[PDB]
Request: fold
Amino acid sequence: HGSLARVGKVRGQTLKVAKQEKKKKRTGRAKRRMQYNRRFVNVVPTFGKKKGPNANS
Amino acid sequence: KKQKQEEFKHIAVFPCKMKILPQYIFNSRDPIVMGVTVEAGQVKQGTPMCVPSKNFVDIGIVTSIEVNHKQVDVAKKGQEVCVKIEPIPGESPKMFGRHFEATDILVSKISRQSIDALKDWFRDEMQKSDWQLIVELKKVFEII
Amino acid sequence: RELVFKEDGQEYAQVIKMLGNGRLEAMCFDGVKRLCHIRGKLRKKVWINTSDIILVGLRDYQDNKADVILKYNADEARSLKAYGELPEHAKINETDTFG
RNA sequence: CUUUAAAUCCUUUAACGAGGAUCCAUUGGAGGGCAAGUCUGGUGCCAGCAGCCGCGGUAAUUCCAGCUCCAAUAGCGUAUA
RNA sequence: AGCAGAGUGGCGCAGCGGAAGCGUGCUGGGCCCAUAACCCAGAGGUCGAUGGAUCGAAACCAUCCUCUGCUACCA
Reply:
């Protein structure tokens, strides 16, 4: 606890999780090429409702 | 500093423990002129004065302090002084032998704002014994 | 049930006068009158009466406003007065729930 | 080499000049308006978010961090007329 | 140094010969979902004390005690 007026407590007592070494994302023209391929090339005919691009069910 | 003393001198009540001499009584009411020894603390002119033994009855404010016919403003511990007490206007004036007697120990009626002024601005002029008298009267006056 | 104590910035106080608009003033045990606040967990669940012992939080940048944490009942206030976390001259005045 | 008062800048042109091409693309946001996780940990009407509705009460799709995703892109966010 | 007013239930008060009462406060119960109002009961009295005038005293008288108002009389 400490006090009700402790400033910045939740920023200061949360756990520190380090970053992850990830691959360089290509930016510019080929990113639009990847977006076009993933949207309008690899589409499969489904039924009902299409899940979102971040649908982590 | 002298100017700030001049405005805030009316609020600052100095601590005191001061003891009535038997039969050294020269007046009874309006004014009360009476020869009293100072057991502890120091007396300053304009002090509100009270009796703890009779449910914190107030006798009035002092006007003039005389040490063997000499007008001395400060009456310190160990000195037998003559104190002239004027009753507070608007209240009932007090008599000797009915509201208070010779066996009573009369103390200064300090206030919380006076304690604040003594702690904040009058830190230089008060002794450790005077601060102990302040704490003792604060437990007597039931001030938290 | 438990006896929570003070901390390095948390002290004790006694309510003097009940105040409107979800606030109160309480007499701290240092000689300073502090305007306290009712905690949002205490706005309807439990009530605070006049002259009761409560736990109060403080601000480290000002001393004009404060905030109440919890409230002590009669037996635990007497037990904490017996331990010595409270001054002996502090009048608890037997705060209790009547019938 | 060219330019120019003389340079510098651009263009031309020798020699060197990249693989995880570390020669590393940021700014906001993910409940609705309004494009985009009912993911995983911490606090528990506190800290804070929130232009507006509103979100936090010891299982937070809105807080604080990690992964993924979304909008524009050498640009993006905020305040005022 | 002294005078005047008062002393009855926790508080204020009526109060005089054939008589411990009033308003408020406290506790227990009922009524209501609960509180106040209301209803039913109870607790709490040296009538400040002593002595006398009396068949009959809280009352008529004398003294003392306590509280509140007054003569101004001091460094």
Remarks:
- The two ends of chain C are 22 Å apart (CA to CA).
- Helices of chain C lie at 74-83.
- Chain C has one domain: 1-99.
- Residues 9 and 70 of chain C are 15 Å apart (CA to CA).
